[PDB]
Amino acid sequence: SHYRAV
Amino acid sequence: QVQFKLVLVGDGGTGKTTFVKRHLTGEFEKKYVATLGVEVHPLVFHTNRGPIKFNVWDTAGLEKFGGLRDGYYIQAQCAIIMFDVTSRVTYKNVPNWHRDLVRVCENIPIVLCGNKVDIKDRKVKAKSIVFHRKKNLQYYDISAKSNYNFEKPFLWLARKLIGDPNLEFVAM
Amino acid sequence: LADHAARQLLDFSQKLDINLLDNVVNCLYHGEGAQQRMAQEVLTHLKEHPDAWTRVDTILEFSQNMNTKYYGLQILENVIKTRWKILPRNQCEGIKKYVVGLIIKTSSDPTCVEKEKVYIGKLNMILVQILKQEWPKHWPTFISDIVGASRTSESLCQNNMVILKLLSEEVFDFSSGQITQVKSKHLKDSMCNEFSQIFQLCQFVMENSQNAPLVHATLETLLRFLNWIPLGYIFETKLISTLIYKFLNVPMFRNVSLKCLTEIAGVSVSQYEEQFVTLFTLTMMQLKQMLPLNTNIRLAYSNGKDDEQNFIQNLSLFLCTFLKEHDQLIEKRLNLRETLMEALHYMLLVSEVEETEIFKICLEYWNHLAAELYRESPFSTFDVPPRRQLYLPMLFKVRLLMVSRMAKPEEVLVVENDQGEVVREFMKDTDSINLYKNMRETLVYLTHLDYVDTERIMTEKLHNQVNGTEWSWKNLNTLCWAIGSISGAMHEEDEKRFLVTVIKDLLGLCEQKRGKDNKAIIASNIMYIVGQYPRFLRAHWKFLKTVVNKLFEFMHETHDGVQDMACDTFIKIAQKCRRHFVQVQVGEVMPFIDEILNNINTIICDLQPQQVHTFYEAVGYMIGAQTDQTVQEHLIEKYMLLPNQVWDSIIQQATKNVDILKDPETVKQLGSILKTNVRACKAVGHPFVIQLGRIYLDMLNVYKCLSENISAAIQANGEMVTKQPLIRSMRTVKRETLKLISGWVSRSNDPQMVAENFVPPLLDAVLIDYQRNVPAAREPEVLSTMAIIVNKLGGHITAEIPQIFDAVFECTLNMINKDFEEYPEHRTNFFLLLQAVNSHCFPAFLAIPPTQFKLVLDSIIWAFKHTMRNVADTGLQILFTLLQNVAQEEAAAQSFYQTYFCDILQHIFSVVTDTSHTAGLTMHASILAYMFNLVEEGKISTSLNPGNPVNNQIFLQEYVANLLKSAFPHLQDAQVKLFVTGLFSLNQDIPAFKEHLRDFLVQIKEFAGEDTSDLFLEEREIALRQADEEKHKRQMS
Ligand SMILES: Nc1nc2c(ncn2[C@@H]2O[C@H](COP(=O)(O)OP(=O)(O)OP(=O)(O)O)[C@@H](O)[C@H]2O)c(=O)[nH]1
Ligand SMILES: [Mg+2]
Incomplete structure (x- = not known):
């Protein structure tokens, strides 16, 4: 999927 | 005589100059006069095994007067990152100061100091200060006004640099 | 020579002197005196010049000292960050080629890499800045090129791993405040789209490479990547198994691999349960091999090296993280129960380490566990709850840990005041107090789970103290702190029995022990314990009376610390059991308050002045519990008799001859009397008015006279006279007068009486005296005092606000108008007073001369322009509240708008675009948002351009656009138009408004051409x- 918010 | 280099960094108006001046002369400064660039101040402590000198490089926490910035960190032996427990933004910027510091100093002793703990209204709660954990930094609550814990960071740095966990200041 | 060198360096019409630059930098890094500062200034000026980089290459072609190379790289990085978008494409390509070639050349040589790592780091950071500027639009094949170069060579692979780590840090960790939202999102999407190649390279290096430094660098890069990469790359590959098997057990990879495992464990998803269970199981299996459960982790840490201590800390972090995250997941598996227990065992072992931070992590986990178990079922030992049944075997171990390592309940500090007074103070919320609070909460939860086990542990500890096996002052103090912490956690009957047993055993121990010091320690511990159980003392009157009489007896004990302990315990008991000193107790003829008041002189004959103040505060707490008005008044009169005698004697002496007020001893006596009065007022509250009413006028007569003296002294020998003891005592008297007035007014529940009686004397005694004083002699507390009064009186003091201003406002403004530094306390208190007046007495502002209102607005603007954070925040709050108040009143709203709206907007924008005022950004946005909403809804019904009756929204758009364009000429018209449209569009979304303002702040620092x-x-x-x-x-x- 897409990256994760930090 | 053994003398190290200490780099004191942190946001503007956190108490770096006040802390250094209180250690140098004992007088508390009530007015905020922003530092321009960096000021080098020699502190001398007396341990049970001789005198130890910290050449503190009190840097400017404001971008406008930042100066060389990372140029000061070169050849630094220890560091103190200071923030203000009455302003959350000062703590929120601790990661940035740490990042700038490590890039020039791969592995040095680092003390994270939270100043102004004497003020009744505390904005950075003691339970929210967790940055030092994953970074192997030594955290200390200090107070330049009230002299609370004001000597612990230097003692920890001296112990780390000399490698003697049983080192103490005698104030001879 | 220095000035000539600076001029040569800054003179860009002549060739740069590399030797001179090297000498200057060497002086900076090894100078002594003004030479180092001059070198700093010269280097900063040289870096500032826009054409410095034209010499940077030359420096890198001729410099010998690494410091000068670092300086040149700093200049180059500044140029890349700022003006990269206006340089010719040929120059950009040349810089790219030079940077890449230098990186490759320096990384190729192992000796150069070893010698200078700061140079390599700076070059990598410059490359990352270039990547941020260009990649991927102008460098679409960077990722593939670096992956191939890494695959070809090992040193190049290590350098590329470092570069990729830096890129990830700058794109995902430190993007906010340096990259706009759109560009940040674009960079994040680009990094995530090409991450497959990077992950494949990392996996290849981890699985195949045998070069330890390269594997370490790859592990660090992976640790950095784990913050943001999609979960699929973690929980659907061999990453966890590879880390646990190939690196976790290796001595030189254990720390970084454990950090990676901790980052993986911190993740919380509901579809990778099997992966988390496998992670836990394999990590536990490895740990049991590399760290036997029979090891003494405390001794290992004590004698361990830095790597060992870091590993222990990381192990505690990993255990705490994974347990707090997936304890329920692990519990559901019966076959893993033993493993779970082993994990708990490890925690307990680490809990024995003499390290504050490691213990804090372990205690955080213990608190979480105790809270969860208590929430499951708060009842004590029906069938036991499932989770409690699982954890029963070690809950007693947790209880023993809590009791054996209890932290000090309170922190006491000796501080020298401004005037030189040595004062004992209690810290409110520090790290150590938080530690004690967490330990107390954990122990209270555990005791609620079952009190028999806690009582048994405490009894065993007390027995071991009595028999001498574990006897020491530290152990007794810790045990007594643990006993006190659990107050209220058990029923009244069990508490009574347990406390009776504990007190009997402690008294026996005190009897058996020999020496004054041991007896003092044991007695102090007994007093602390009894002072922590107010319900016990309330239940039994005889015990309470015996305790109080024992405290009075101790108050005559000259042994160090006994009097302070007695006074602290007395005030604690008086506060907690106040209602039991005023009523008549069975077997008594009169209430204990009368008995104490009759013998007050003989009780405090040996106490020091601060202890006397504490005693008076405790007695005032007791007095304030008397509900009857007449008896309370009689008690108050009988309560201040001793201070009042000295007060009256001093007043009569002054009336006979005012010169007595210059006698230092009289000033010390007055200060002590006023401190006693302040403490009594704090303890008693409103009914203390009578005492104040008895001395008020006389106090105001002592204040003013003393004030005058101070001023005269300053006029005779300058500010240095403020350091003399006599002036310090006079200032103490003034400050105590102000403190008494402020405290009573704050605690007074009668604004009308206060305004009628106590304010008019203030207007002339303090305010006009404040005006007549020289600037050096003005007391800032006055202003603060007034603020308090306003905060309490509001509408009842509005009519007097004008006069008050005429006494303080102007004379204060001229003191804090020449800069932002001098008289910090005056600025703080003045703006607090202005805030109070604005919040509670706005009609005063609406009913003053327009020139005075303009001066007030100018003062507010001066406030929010301050470098001091508190002053600026107060100014911003004042401005926001003033805008709301003006909006509330329709009549003057339009006039205020047409007079000050544009000016306030201009000043707000001036502070907003300043880097020094970012801490107040939130407030800035709020104000701006409100203003723009005010202009968009149509509240301003009068055009702000009388000459051109244009729509308000369009006029404001043009005005703000022109203002920003003039302030920052290098901005583009499209940029400003978009910024203004967002200002007028995001006015109802404060987070989005603040993000927009941050985007603009970063934009205005870069030349986009x-x-x-x-x-x-x-x-x-x-x-x-x-x-x-x-x-x-x-x-x-
Ligand atoms: N309440 C309180 N104020 C303090 C304390 N220490 C310093 N201050 C105040 O906080 C401000 C700090 O000013 P400086 O010492 O110049 O701060 P700095 O961080 O060195 O400033 P820059 O050089 O601009 O980064 C001043 O107002 C100090 O008087 C403290 O322990 N308590
Ligand atoms: Mg400073």
Whole structure:
């Protein structure tokens, strides 16, 4: 999927 | 005589100059006069095994007067990152100061100091200060006004640099 | 020579002197005196010049000292960050080639890499800055090229791993405040789209490479990547198994691999349960091999090296993280129960380490576990709850840990005041107090789970103290702190029995022990324990009376610390059991308050003045519990008799001859009397008015006279006279007078009486005296005092606000108008007073001369321009509240708008675009948002351009656009137009407004030239339009 918010 | 280099960094108006001046002369400064660039101040402590000198490089926490910035960190032996427990933004910027510091100093002793703990209204709660954990930094609550814990960071740095966990200041 | 060198360096019409630059930098890094500062200034000026980089290459072609090379790289990085968008493409390509070639050349040589790592790091950071500027639009094949170069060579692979780590840090960790939202999102998407190749390279290096430094660098890069990469790359590959098997057990990879495992464990998803269970199981299996459960982790840490201590800390972190996250997941598996217990065992072992931070992590986990178990079922030992049944075997171990390592309940500090007074103070919320609070909460939860086990542990500890096996002052103090911490955690009957047993055993121990010091320690511990159980003392009157009489007896004990302990315990008991000193107790003829008051002189004959003040505060707490008005008044009169005698004697002496007020001893006596009065007022509250009413006028007579003296002294020998003891005592008297007035007014429940009686004397005694004083002699507390009064009186003091201003306002403004530094306390208190007046006495502002209101507005603007954070925040709050108040009153709203709206907006924008005022950004945005909403709804019904009756919104758009363009000429018209449209569109979304302001702040620091590609004008406009539509829909709803 897409990256994760930090 | 053994003398190290200490780099004191942190946001503007956190108490770096006040802390250094209180250690140098004992007088508390009530007015905020922003530092321009960096000021080098020699502190001398007396341990049970001789005198130890910290050449503190009190840097400017404001971008406008930042100066060389990372140029000061070169050849630094220890560091103190200071923030203000009455302003959350000062703590929120601790990661940035740490990042700038490590890039020039791969592995040095680092003390994270939270100043102004004497003020009744505390904005950075003691339970929210967790940055030092994953970074192997030594955290200390200090107070330049009230002299609370004001000597612990230097003692920890001296112990780390000399490698003697049983080192103490005698104030001879 | 120095000035000539500086001029030569800054003279860009002549060739740079590399030797001179090297000498200057060597002086900076090894100088002594003004030479180092001069070198700093010269280097900063040289870096500032826009044409410095034209010499940077030359420096890198001729410099010998690494410091000068670092300086040149700093200049180059500044140029890349700022002006990269206006340089010719040929120059950009040349810089790219030079940077890449230098990186490759320096990384190729192992000796050069070893010698200078700061140079390599700076070069990598410059490369990352170039990547941020260009990649991927102008460098679409960077990722593939670096992957191939890494695959070809090992040193190049290590350098590329470092570069990729830096890129990830700058794109995902430190993007906010340095990259706009649109460009940050673009960079994140680009990094995530090409991450497959990077992950494949990392996996290849981990699985195949045998070069330890390269594997370490790859592990560090992976640790950095784990913060953001999609979960699939973690929980659907061999990453966890590879880390646990190939690196976790290796001595030189254990720390970094454990950090990676901790980062993986911190993740919380509901579809990778098997992966988390496998992670836990394999990590536990490895740990049991590399760290036997029979090891003494405390001794290992004590004698361990830095790597060992870091490993122990990381192990504690990993255990705490994974347990707090997936304890329920692990519990559900029966076959893993033993493993779970082993994990707990490890925690307990680490809990024995003499390290504050490691213990804090372990205690955080213990608190979480105890809280969860208590929430499951708060009842004590029906069938035991499932989770409690699982954890029963070690809950007693946790209880023993809590009791054996209890932290000090309170922190006491000796501080020298401004005047030189040595004062004992209690810290409110520090790290150590938080530690004690967490330990107390954990122990209270555990005791609620079952009190028999806690009582048994405490009894065993007390027995071991009695028999001498574990006897020491530290152990007794810790045990007594643990006993006190659990107050109220058990029923009244069990508490009574347990406390009776504990006190009997402690008294026996005190009897058996020999020496004054041991007896003092044991007695102090007994007093602390009894003072922590107010319910016990309330239940039994004989015990309470015996305790109080024992405290009075101790108050005559000259042994160090006994009197302070007695006074602290007495005030604690008086506060907690106040209602039991005023009523008549069975077997008594009169209430204990009368008995104490009759013998007050003989009780405090040996106490020090601060202890006397504490005793008076405790007695005042007791007095304040008397509900009857007449008896309370009689008690108050009998209560202040001793201070009042000295007060009256001093007043009569002064009336006979005012010169007595210059006698230092009289001033010390007055200060002590006023401190006693302040403490009594704090303890008693409103009914103390009578005492104040008895001395008020006389106090105001002592204040003013003393004030005058101080001023005279300053006029005779300057400010240095303020350091003399006599002036310090006079200032102490003045400050105590102000403290008494402020305290009573704050605690007084009668604004009308206060305004009628106590304010008019203040107007002349303090305010006009404050005005007549020289600037050096003015007391800042006055202003603060007034603020308090206003905060309490509001509408009852509005009529007096003008006069008050005429006494303090102008004379104060002229003191804090020449700079932002001098008289910090005066600025703070003045703006607090202005805030109080604005919040509670706005009609005073609405009913003053227009010139005075203009001066007030100018003072507020001066306030929010301050470097001091508190002053600026107060100014911003004042401005926001003033805007709301003006909006509330319709009549003057239009006039205020047409007179000050544009000026306030201009000043707000001036502070907003300043880096020194970012801490107040939130408030800035709020104000701005409100203002723009005010201009968009139509509240301003009068055009702000009388000459041209144009729509308010259009006029404001043009005005702000022109103001920003003039302030920052290098901005593009499209940039300013988009910024203004967002200002007028995001006015109902404060977080979005603040993000927009941050985007503008980062934009104005970069010269975008004529390039509109990096601005993402289309995406930003689409976002603004979506926000406008959402706000419109919310308005319709
Ligand atoms: N309440 C309180 N104020 C303090 C304390 N220490 C310093 N201050 C105040 O906080 C401000 C700090 O000013 P400086 O010492 O110049 O701060 P700095 O961080 O060195 O400033 P820059 O050089 O601009 O980064 C001043 O107002 C100090 O008087 C403290 O322990 N308590
Ligand atoms: Mg400073």
